[PDB]
Amino acid sequence: PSISEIDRSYLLSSDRLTEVDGNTLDVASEEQVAALKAQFENLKDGDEVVIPNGKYANLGQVTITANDVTIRAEQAGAAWLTGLIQFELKGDDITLDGLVFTEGGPNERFGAVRMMGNGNTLQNSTFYYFNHDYTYEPDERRSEYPKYLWVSLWGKDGKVINNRFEGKQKRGTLIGVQKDDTPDNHLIANNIFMDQKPNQFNEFDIKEAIRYNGNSWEAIRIGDSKSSQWDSSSKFVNNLMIDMDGERELISIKSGDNTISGNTIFQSAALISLRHGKGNTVENNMILGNEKRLTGGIRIYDEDHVIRNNYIANTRGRDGVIEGNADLRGGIVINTGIIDVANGEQLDQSVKGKELNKQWTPKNITIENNSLVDTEWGIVYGNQSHRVSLFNNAEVEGIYAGVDIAFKHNVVDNSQTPEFVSVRATHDFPLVGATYTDETYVGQVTDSELIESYSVELPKVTVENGLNAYQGEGADVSKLSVVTAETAGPDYVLENTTK
């Protein structure tokens, strides 16, 4: 298909995929489940457990202390682990391969797979609507629903590769990186993520609790506010994401030196979010909104990031549905923050109101060689108000615009619908120290007098592999390719699943 014609059937198609029919699998008896669990916890270093085709309910807490072990399905996709389970991987160099988690839920809130050792790997595995069997009630303190993860990484050199993460529809990030003060060097690559979405269980009906119950539905969170001033050096690369609509943050980066690159993000009403931490790079992504409401590209806080050679097309919408969370959408959004970074101010846990979980005004951001095509809101200069916290609805006083934002060789092409806003500048929050080199903006530009110069004539346009290529400007199409099931996700698809 051409870009506009892409659909999930196309993205999910590959001749390499085997079909596994769950209705051919026998249900293991309680004695068989117990015997399998003993195999797991009795492993010697270097051994392997091959799980016979079948469905194994309620394995519960499975602690692997052995090093250099593999737990794999006899046939990939044909060992279905249902009811409550958590693999707590404590040894090093443990690989889980070919497993299915469905019709059940995590035995503990940090996931079905707690990757605690070093060199741990989760590969060729499928989660299918693993939202069940755990208590899920608004708490007494503030009617907050519990956050459950599917996978967490707590060690070093983790790999989460060639999996399928489908249908996360209760609160909590899908993959969480729980890090310390040194780099982690995790690789989250070549996975398929589909159909994460919130408010399937009326959670938003408790109106007073919506700003926090509507948060923590990310596909991945890399770090956290406390650890955000350290490098993770992790990679979220070459993934395929389809209808990932959890919350304003699709990928929430909360640490430094990360790479969020080469992903295809299709019809996902959620943004790449540089939320805390410095020096992250977002490059060569294909963000295909396909005219879906509240799609968008990248939102930016904090310092030293590089946003380069992304292709962001057919995105729609500006204002998220939940107020008070600075949920301002577009192709590339330069957020306001609450600190005077132009005068060297930092977030600092010691300073009341400017703690590490607050909003670090962006500074020293390079935004270069991006192509934004038919984006209803293209490059958006922020004007958000910020509240004290997700729990305290008072408005913060003292709001600051991005500083030292360098724009070079971007193309924002709204030639098709020039009433769309290619660049949303605003006198309410003028960027400080912004620079413009060979920018091309076609379509509406608000408060345009704030921008030193730009061209309104497109360079020669050609189409290469269905992408628009702009002569000498914008995203180099030779660095771009659509990720499909040809390389992403496991080597099988499942039949006779149940949500």
Task: Tally the C-alpha atoms within 13 A of residue 278's C-alpha that lie toward its C-beta.
Answer: 11
Q: Which helix (H) or strand (E) holds 254?
A: strand 249-254
Angle at 482 between CA 471 and CA 306, to 5 degrees: 65
- Which residue is it, tokens 């737990």? 71
CA distance 177 to 257: 14
Cα→Cα distances 131→12, 152, 245, 404, 448, Å? 23, 16, 16, 44, 48
Task: Give first-to-last CA distance, the chain, whole Å.
Answer: 30
On whether the CB atoms of residues 268 and 246 are closer than 8 A, the answer is no
On whether the CB atoms of residues 317 and 329 are closer than 8 A, the answer is yes
CA distance 483 to 14: 12
- Which residue is it, tokens 């101010």? 345
Cα→Cα distances 10→3, 7, 124, 237, 398, Å? 11, 5, 20, 20, 48
CA distance 460 to 389: 48
Residue at 323: amino acid letter: E
CATH superfamily of 3-495: Single-stranded right-handed beta-helix, Pectin lyase-like (2.160.20.10)
Cα→Cα distances 21→79, 80, 95, 494, Å? 11, 11, 24, 6
3-state secondary structure of 230: coil
Task: Look at strands 461-464 and 467-470 and give their pairing.
Answer: antiparallel
Kindly state the tokens that stand for 115.
């990757």
Count of CB atoms within 10 A of residue 355's CB? Answer: 15
Task: Tally the C-alpha atoms within 13 A of residue 354's C-alpha that lie toward its C-beta.
Answer: 18
CA distance 221 to 106: 18
On whether the CB atoms of residues 333 and 296 are closer than 8 A, the answer is yes
Kindly state the tokens that stand for 297.
């590209």
CA distance 436 to 434: 7
Cα→Cα distances 211→100, 207, 247, 251, 390, Å? 33, 9, 11, 18, 6
In sequence order, which residues have a C-beta less than 8 Å from that of residue 9 and are 6 or more positions away? none
At residue 181, what are phi and psi to the nearest 5 degrees? -85, 0
Cα→Cα distances 244→31, 100, 218, 224, 247, Å? 39, 20, 9, 21, 9
At residue 128, what are phi and psi to the nearest 5 degrees? -130, 100
| 307 strand-pairing partners | 282, 367
In sequence order, which residues have a C-beta less than 8 Å from that of residue 51 and are 6 or more positions away? 36, 71, 72, 73, 74, 79, 99
Task: Tally the C-alpha atoms within 13 A of residue 39's C-alpha that lie toward its C-beta.
Answer: 17
3-state secondary structure of 344: coil
Residue at 467: amino acid letter: L
On whether the CB atoms of residues 265 and 249 are closer than 8 A, the answer is no
CA distance 284 to 44: 43
CA distance 452 to 431: 12
CA distance 179 to 226: 10
In sequence order, which residues have a C-beta less than 8 Å from that of residue 268 and are 6 or more positions away? 241, 242, 243, 244, 245, 250, 295
Q: Where are the domains of the chain?
A: 3-495
Count of CB atoms within 10 A of residue 27's CB? Answer: 12
Integer Rg of the chain from CA? 23
What DSSP designation does 250 have?
Answer: E
Q: Which helix (H) or strand (E) holds 106?
A: strand 99-106
Count of CB atoms within 10 A of residue 171's CB? Answer: 24
On whether the CB atoms of residues 313 and 3 are closer than 8 A, the answer is yes
CA distance 233 to 27: 42
- Percent helix, strand and coil across the chain, each to the nearest 5: 10, 35, 55
Kindly state the tokens that stand for 178.
């729980």
3-state secondary structure of 210: helix
Residue at 324: amino acid letter: G
User: In terms of Cα–Cα distance, which of 195, 192, 73 is closest to 129?
Assistant: 195
CA distance 328 to 310: 19
Count of CB atoms within 10 A of residue 305's CB? Answer: 26
User: In terms of Cα–Cα distance, which of 45, 102, 44, 94 is closest to 72?
Assistant: 94
Greatest distance between any 2 Cα atoms in the chain: 75
Answer left, alpha or beta for residue 103, where phi above 0 means left and psi between -120 and 50 means alpha: left
CA distance 172 to 246: 9
Kindly state the tokens that stand for 163.
């999996």
